[PDB]
Design a binder for this molecule. Sequence first.
Ligand SMILES: CCCCCCCCCCCCCCCCC[C@@H](O)O[C@H](CO[C@H](O)CCCCCCCCCCCCCCC)COP(=O)(O)OCC[N+](C)(C)C
Lengths: 57, 69
Amino acid sequence: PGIVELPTLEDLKVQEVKVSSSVLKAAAHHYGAQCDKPNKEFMLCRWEEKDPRRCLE
Amino acid sequence: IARTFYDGPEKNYEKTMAILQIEAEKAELRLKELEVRRLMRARGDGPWYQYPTIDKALIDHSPKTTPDN
Ligand SMILES: CCCCCCCCCCCCCCCCC[C@@H](O)O[C@H](CO[C@H](O)CCCCCCCCCCCCCCC)COP(=O)(O)OCC[N+](C)(C)C
């Protein structure tokens, strides 16, 4: 019943953060201190929409 | 004998009418109750035959460590 709408591949293209887990863990504290506003905006979108398709931007 | 031991026919007449009215009302009430019971059991929209359902107050409306619940 119904058709599931999925984003196109071009809508899922972005520059990837291709550092390993060790680099990320080393940077984690400062990264959370500095990049907090976009991260919290994304998390609020994620927990309010309950849909990965509505928080791609 | 009639004066000492018995009464007039009007008393028995009107008592019979009262008894008949009571019994007819009871019969109609019994039939109506049976019909109402049948309808309530068939539909479930009345106060009777209300089988329990899960209380919605038990649901936890909190973030669930995962955005998609
Ligand atoms: C002039 C007469 C000549 C001829 C005589 C004829 C003899 C007839 C006597 C025989 C009587 C037969 C017994 C039938 C009694 C009827 C009982 C009842 O239906 O009547 C009650 C009436 O009560 C009476 O007082 C009944 C009293 C009769 C008791 C009979 C006992 C006789 C036994 C004697 C044995 C000897 C004892 C000594 C032992 C050694 C009803 O109560 P109540 O709802 O309020 O009254 C409604 C009517 N009212 C309102 C108009 C008044």
